[PDB]
Amino acid sequence: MVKPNWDNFKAKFSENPQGNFEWFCYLLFCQEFKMPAGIFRYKNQSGIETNPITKDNEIIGWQSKFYDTKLSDNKADLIEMIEKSKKAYPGLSKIIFYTN
Amino acid sequence: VKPNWDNFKAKFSENPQGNFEWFCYLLFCQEFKMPAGIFRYKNQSGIETNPITKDNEIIGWQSKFYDTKLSDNKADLIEMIEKSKKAYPGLSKIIFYTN
Amino acid sequence: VKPNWDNFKAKFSENPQGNFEWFCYLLFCQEFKMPAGIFRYKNQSGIETNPITKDNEIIGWQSKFYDTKLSDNKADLIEMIEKSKKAYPGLSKIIFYTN
């Protein structure tokens, strides 16, 4: 295998850490909740979509953010994220949140 | 070559503090012409090695690698100064290295 | 494959404790069928992650990598037991891993 290393990530993707983190989280969400496509479809960085999914009479969505400091320091951003998520689609009931 | 601390943190992510200490030990030995090194106890207190002597001035050194601005870390420095003279009474100078 | 701790210490000499903890986390998740992992606080006390629940039994885990025989280390274990119940009052079982 291979251990996680966010210093490799920040050195490698230095011009856009947030957008690449969003790509990575979308791929993992598809592998767990949607129906699995393969490597040839996942290679398109342009293919991100934020649509929620319906399961077991519940509605499930997702969001993610990459940070250099403690989550105590970014409360305004977390609040902004929650309210934007409900604004974008009003039927939402559960949110998976990813961070480093 | 150019100083880049992202390269450093990517290369030495399993142990940053321990590799920064070695970088400073090599530069200290180059600066004060001690090519065969210096004696060092296990878990040595105050400063990183035993002191050197030069022109009746006695000198030691200390290094710290931080993510914070130095103003957040004052208590470490006060502790360093007090814990050194407890152990090495004649000490005259300390050189401090940081990123 | 066969267990060899000289191979381990040669491979992971920059950080033995941190890699042994990950070996135990993966084996725990395999044993108790938690394939997507477990929540964990920064500098978490007593046990390595938050507990799991199973058949009305609440379970945690702890790992230590040592050069000494376990008899030399009794105070760590007493501290472990006492510091866990302070934080997670309903806890029922702890699983302990060591070399």
Side-chain angles (χ1 to χ4, degrees):
Chain A
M1 321 148 323
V2 64
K3 218 206 244 203
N5 182 343
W6 299 109
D7 305 301
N8 274 354
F9 178 93
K10 191 159 58 168
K12 191 176 185 176
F13 304 110
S14 50
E15 284 70 85
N16 186 14
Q18 298 288 0
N20 288 283
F21 189 73
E22 186 173 18
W23 181 27
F24 187 23
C25 295
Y26 174 64
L27 266 43
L28 294 174
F29 186 89
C30 295
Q31 289 290 96
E32 182 171 7
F33 297 99
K34 308 213 297 173
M35 204 291 147
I39 293 295
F40 181 79
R41 298 293 154 189
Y42 294 152
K43 89 191 192 308
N44 279 324
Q45 183 176 4
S46 62
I48 318 305
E49 78 178 22
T50 57
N51 302 68
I53 192 161
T54 285
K55 190 183 68 168
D56 195 11
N57 307 112
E58 217 199 1
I59 297 93
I60 308 177
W62 72 273
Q63 223 309 308
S64 73
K65 239 134 64 173
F66 184 80
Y67 296 129
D68 303 294
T69 194
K70 171 40 154 53
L71 294 174
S72 287
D73 310 347
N74 290 94
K75 176 175 169 282
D77 286 10
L78 276 64
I79 296 287
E80 172 78 21
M81 179 281 297
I82 295 159
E83 65 187 318
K84 177 262 289 303
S85 302
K86 197 59 148 69
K87 182 181 178 181
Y89 325 82
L92 184 60
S93 72
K94 190 194 296 278
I95 299 176
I96 314 305
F97 184 73
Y98 303 90
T99 188
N100 67 300
Chain B
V1 72
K2 54 207 298 223
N4 183 329
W5 302 109
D6 298 329
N7 288 2
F8 184 92
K9 284 179 290 190
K11 287 165 63 78
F12 306 111
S13 60
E14 287 277 272
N15 186 4
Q17 294 257 330
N19 286 279
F20 186 72
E21 183 179 328
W22 190 41
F23 189 21
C24 300
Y25 177 53
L26 296 174
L27 292 177
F28 185 90
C29 289
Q30 294 282 93
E31 166 107 22
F32 293 104
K33 288 135 199 313
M34 287 270 132
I38 308 171
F39 190 91
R40 187 180 67 206
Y41 299 98
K42 170 185 27 70
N43 277 305
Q44 183 149 7
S45 66
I47 48 168
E48 311 267 45
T49 64
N50 286 14
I52 66 167
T53 198
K54 184 173 185 179
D55 300 342
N56 301 357
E57 181 173 285
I58 298 166
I59 311 177
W61 69 282
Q62 153 75 287
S63 69
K64 280 307 154 167
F65 188 79
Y66 294 129
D67 297 352
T68 52
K69 298 299 199 296
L70 283 163
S71 311
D72 301 343
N73 309 113
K74 183 181 60 158
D76 273 303
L77 317 181
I78 270 50
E79 178 173 28
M80 161 184 96
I81 292 159
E82 205 28 73
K83 203 174 302 187
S84 301
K85 211 214 253 163
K86 179 63 178 286
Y88 314 122
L91 180 64
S92 181
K93 176 184 284 168
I94 303 174
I95 308 183
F96 184 88
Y97 299 91
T98 189
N99 66 307
Chain C
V1 72
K2 61 207 289 213
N4 183 329
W5 302 109
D6 297 329
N7 288 2
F8 184 93
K9 283 179 289 189
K11 288 164 63 78
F12 306 111
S13 59
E14 287 278 270
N15 187 3
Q17 294 260 324
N19 287 280
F20 186 72
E21 182 180 327
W22 190 41
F23 189 21
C24 300
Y25 177 54
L26 296 175
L27 292 177
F28 184 91
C29 290
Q30 294 283 94
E31 166 107 22
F32 293 104
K33 316 230 163 293
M34 287 270 132
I38 306 171
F39 189 93
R40 187 180 66 206
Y41 299 98
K42 170 185 27 70
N43 277 306
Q44 183 149 8
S45 64
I47 47 167
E48 310 267 45
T49 64
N50 286 13
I52 65 166
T53 199
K54 184 171 186 177
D55 298 343
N56 300 357
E57 181 172 286
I58 298 167
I59 311 177
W61 70 282
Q62 153 76 287
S63 70
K64 281 307 154 167
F65 189 78
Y66 295 129
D67 296 356
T68 52
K69 299 299 199 297
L70 284 164
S71 312
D72 302 344
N73 310 113
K74 183 181 61 159
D76 274 302
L77 317 180
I78 270 51
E79 177 172 28
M80 161 184 96
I81 292 159
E82 202 31 70
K83 203 174 301 187
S84 301
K85 211 214 253 163
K86 179 63 179 288
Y88 313 124
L91 180 64
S92 183
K93 176 183 286 168
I94 303 175
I95 307 184
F96 183 88
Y97 299 91
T98 188
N99 66 309

